[PDB]
Amino acid sequence: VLSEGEWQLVLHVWAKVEADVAGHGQDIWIRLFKSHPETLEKFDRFKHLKTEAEMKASEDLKKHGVTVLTALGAILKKKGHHEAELKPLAQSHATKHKIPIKYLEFISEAIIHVLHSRHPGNFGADAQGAMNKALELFRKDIAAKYKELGYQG
Ligand code: HEM
Ligand SMILES: OC[C@H]1O[C@H](O[C@H]2O[C@H](CO)[C@@H](O)[C@H](O)[C@H]2O)[C@H](O)[C@@H](O)[C@@H]1O
């Protein structure tokens, strides 16, 4: 359970992400797909992208980043009371997309890397710790739902 202070560190940096969610999403995809190429294979719609240039030029990938980060933002704004938001997400990711918890760890790492790079003014050690705590809570709760849905994760 995160403290209100921790949630505020999370929400304060997210406020910066929201100045341009599309741009942050692109950086996150590039970071994720380069650090862990295997994750790209899970996207039938994007697995043909061969380079960072192609990823950057993809309007659909950009749009999906907006979708993903907006969904994550809604979860973070719930400050732990995200039961309703997690249900549809866990169901599609467990049953249709088949995304292991390990891959969720990979994208969490990419998110933190990008925030660390773009936002040193709001992403110092304490802020990063709070964000990591929030993402771990997210993954913990997703894992529990995966279990209920019958997916090993
Ligand atoms: C921060 C974690 C994540 C969030 C908030 C998230 C959110 C979303 C949302 C909102 C959608 C669209 C609706 C749906 O199908 O549920 C989606 C689709 C999808 N997600 Fe995720 N996702 C996350 C992580 C991942 C990861 C790590 C992978 C893959 C390694 C993944 C693979 C997919 C796939 C394959 C789709 C379908 C894309 C398409 O439209 O072709 N997701 N995700
Ligand atoms: O922070 C680094 C550790 O990250 C992962 O573990 C955290 O998140 C898991 C959920 O994805 C939890 O099960 C675990 O309890 C958390 O500590 C990773 O699995 C660990 O190997 C890393 O050391």
UniProtKB/Swiss-Prot annotation:
Location (main, coarse): cytoplasm
GO cellular component: extracellular exosome; sarcoplasm
Globin domain sequence ranges: 1-147
GO biological process, one term: removal of superoxide radicals
Catalytic reactions on record: Fe(III)-heme b-[protein] + nitric oxide + H2O = Fe(II)-heme b-[protein] + nitrite + 2 H(+); H2O2 + AH2 = A + 2 H2O
Superkingdom per UniProt: Eukaryota
Pfam families linked to this entry: Globin
Residues that coordinate or bind O2: H64
Gene3D superfamilies: 6.10.140.2100, 6.10.140.2110
Subcellular localization(s) per the UniProt record: Cytoplasm, Sarcoplasm
Enzyme class: oxidoreductase
Phosphothreonine modified-residue sites: T67
UniProt-listed Enzyme Commission number(s): 1.7.-.-, 1.11.1.-
GO function term, MF aspect, one: heme binding
Family the UniProt entry places it in: Belongs to the globin family.
Subunit: Monomeric.
Primary role: Monomeric heme protein which primary function is to store oxygen and facilitate its diffusion within muscle tissues. Reversibly binds oxygen through a pentacoordinated heme iron and enables its timely and efficient release as needed during periods of heightened demand. Depending on the oxidative conditions of tissues and cells, and in addition to its ability to bind oxygen, it also has a nitrite reductase activity whereby it regulates the production of bioactive nitric oxide.
Protein name, per record: Myoglobin
